[PDB]
Design a binder for this molecule. Structure first.
Ligand SMILES: CCCCCCCCCCCCCCCCCC(=O)OC[C@H](COP(=O)([O-])OCC(O)COP(=O)([O-])OC[C@@H](COC(=O)CCCCCCCCCCCCCCCCC)OC(=O)CCCCCCCCCCCCCCCCC)OC(=O)CCCCCCCCCCCCCCCCC
Ligand SMILES: CCCCCCCCCCCCCCCCCC(=O)OC[C@H](COP(=O)([O-])OCC(O)COP(=O)([O-])OC[C@@H](COC(=O)CCCCCCCCCCCCCCCCC)OC(=O)CCCCCCCCCCCCCCCCC)OC(=O)CCCCCCCCCCCCCCCCC
Ligand SMILES: CCCCCCCCCCCCCCCCC[C@@H](O)O[C@H](CO[C@H](O)CCCCCCCCCCCCCCC)COP(=O)(O)OCC[N+](C)(C)C
Ligand SMILES: CCCCCCCCCCCCCCCCCC(=O)OC[C@H](COP(=O)(O)OCCN)OC(=O)CCCCCCCCCCCCCCCCC
Ligand SMILES: CCCCCCCCCCCC(=O)OC[C@H](COP(=O)([O-])O)OC(=O)CCCCCCCCCCC
Lengths: 121, 174
């Protein structure tokens, strides 16, 4: 468990209050569009399994499938973005706090670096 | 002609001997050349004159793209991706230019051989030497870089060559 047990982590909290400071996903997010596509596929498979016209029957059912998938996908994207942002924040804080472990290195140009040449023949 | 530079594409001054006939027989080659001029050369000349006259009415220009010099792989820092990309592109363009230089010299050599004809071995020594020098330099620069050649690999090869030369010079001076 890497990020479990992080200080100040509220149990069973899908999205903490500190996640409100991050940019929310756009409604036209391609991930949200793919979630809606998954919902549409679920509706089509529902019609096919129940032996209804695949594209025609149950327009309300297809609409509810798409809407539910988009809703859960939006909240899932929010949580995923928050977790990745938290990981990057903690990594940068650790790099700041351990300069001995992460030291700057002298930069030498390729005119100074000697690299062996392997001919192709 | 003014289409190409006479200095870039040299050509010796032509020396056509004056005809000095020794027979009273007619010249079939002369008669056929006259017929060719009267039947082909004049019609094609008139057609080209009309075409050029049409071209001159809607004259427009196109230009030759100019590239400014950018720092090369020697100046680029280690794992500096932007400078590395710029240097690699410049090196590739220079490689293409050098290939075309070798092509120009080779074309000059071929033309001189064909022109000199039966005495090409002696009269084309000047063009053979230029091709020898150009080919030697081009081979030394881009001989065995490989399919995935790059400015870094060419620089490494040049460094190896320079180290070998320095070692040889130090041994000679020792
Ligand atoms: C048609 C699409 C074909 C694939 C194109 C992929 C790259 C371009 C995606 C894009 O810009 O979409 C935006 C565009 C709409 O977005 P927008 O509002 O215009 O805004 C543009 C973004 O700003 C543009 O933002 P972006 O360029 O930063 O896009 C970010 C993108 C960048 O992601 C990538 O570069 C990775 C793409 C590959 C993902 C893995 C593919 C695995 C193999 C394919 C099969 C998967 C199972 C099915 O990452 C995501 O979107 C993550 C979720 C994956 C969505 C795409 C899924 C493609 C499935 C293709 C089949 O969405 C689409 O065109 C498709 C959305 C999903 C519905 C159709 C799904 C496929 C249907 C046929 C399935 C056949 C089997
Ligand atoms: C959208 C087009 C397709 C894209 C595919 C991309 C991937 C996603 C898949 C999503 C699938 C959803 C539907 C699944 C159930 C389909 C059932 C079926 O038969 O449907 C027939 C149905 C029409 O026939 P029907 O008479 O109504 O059907 C009655 C019976 O079901 C008729 O059936 P039957 O009782 O006569 O039985 C015959 C058939 C019955 O069995 C089937 O027909 C197979 C049903 C299941 C297929 C697989 C479902 C998805 C599973 C995941 C796929 C992953 C794909 C990627 C991975 C690589 C490939 C595997 O059984 C066989 O043929 C057995 C021998 C063959 C077995 C081996 C092959 C199986 C399929 C393997 C490939 C799977 C991928 C392609 C799936 C394509 C599905 C259409 O076709 C459709 O509904 C096709 C989709 C139409 C969408 C229209 C959308 C609106 C208009 C266009 C708008 C475009 C965008 C506009 C934007 C704005 C512009 C301005
Ligand atoms: C595709 C595979 C199936 C996906 C369906 C999964 C269904 C999951 C069921 C719950 C979903 C909704 C839950 C929302 C309310 C509960 C939120 C909270 O209670 O749980 C959170 C945690 O739960 C999850 O974060 C929420 C569900 C995440 C499911 C994402 C599936 C990702 C699969 C990758 C493919 C993407 C599929 C997209 C369509 C689902 C925080 O609890 P926490 O105390 O902190 O975690 C303890 C676990 N420890 C100990 C290891 C740390
Ligand atoms: C019958 C089946 C119907 C399936 C689709 C049903 C839902 C369609 C949308 C209805 C609600 C419209 C709405 O309220 O839109 C609001 C918002 C518009 O976004 P916008 O304001 O442009 O945002 C710009 C950046 N903020 O909306 C959005 O941003 C939502 C966009 C993402 C979710 C929808 C993705 C497309 C639908 C699923 C893919 C398959 C559709 C197949 C349709 C076939 C023909 C019926
Ligand atoms: C919220 C307050 C409003 C009022 C209360 C509403 C309560 C919930 C709505 C009830 C839905 C309903 O009754 O109809 C469901 C329809 C089709 O009905 P049916 O004939 O298939 O039984 O369509 C469906 O079958 C729904 C399909 C959804 C499937 C589950 C999708 C899961 C989404 C996340 C997946 C990751």
């Amino acid at each position: 468990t890497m990020m479990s047990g992080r200080p100040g982590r509220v149990p069973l909290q899908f999205l903490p209050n500190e996640a409100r400071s991050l940019p929310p996903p756009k409604l036209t997010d391609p991930r949200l569009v793919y979630m809606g596509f998954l919902g549409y596929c679920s509706g089509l498979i529902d019609n096919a399994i129940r032996r209804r016209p695949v594209v025609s029957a149950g327009l309300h059912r297809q609409l509810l499938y798409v809407t539910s998938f988009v809703f859960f996908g939006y909240y899932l994207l929010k949580r995923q973005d928050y977790m990745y942002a938290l990981r990057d924040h903690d990594m940068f804080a650790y790099v700041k706090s351990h300069p001995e472990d992460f030291p700057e290195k002298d930069k030498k140009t390729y005119g100074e670096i000697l690299e062996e040449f392997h001919p192709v023949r | 002609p003014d289409s190409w530079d006479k200095d870039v594409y040299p050509e010796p001054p032509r020396r056509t001997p004056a005809p000095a006939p020794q027979t009273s027989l007619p010249n079939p080659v002369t008669y056929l050349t006259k017929i060719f001029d009267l039947l082909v050369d004049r019609p094609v000349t008139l057609a080209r004159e009309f075409i050029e006259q049409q071209h001159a009415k809607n004259r427009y220009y196109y230009y030759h793209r100019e590239f400014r010099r950018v720092p090369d792989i020697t100046e680029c820092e280690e794992k500096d991706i932007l400078c590395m990309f710029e240097a690699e592109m410049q090196w590739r363009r220079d490689y293409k230019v050098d290939q075309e230089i070798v092509n120009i010299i080779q074309e000059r050599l071929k033309a001189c051989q064909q022109r000199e004809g039966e005495s090409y071995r002696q009269n084309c020594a000047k063009e053979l030497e230029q091709f020898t020098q150009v080919s030697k330099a081009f081979q030394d620069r881009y001989s065995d870089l490989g399919a995935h050649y790059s400015a870094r690999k060419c620089l490494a090869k040049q460094k190896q060559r320079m180290l070998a030369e320095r070692k040889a010079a130090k041994e000679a001076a020792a």
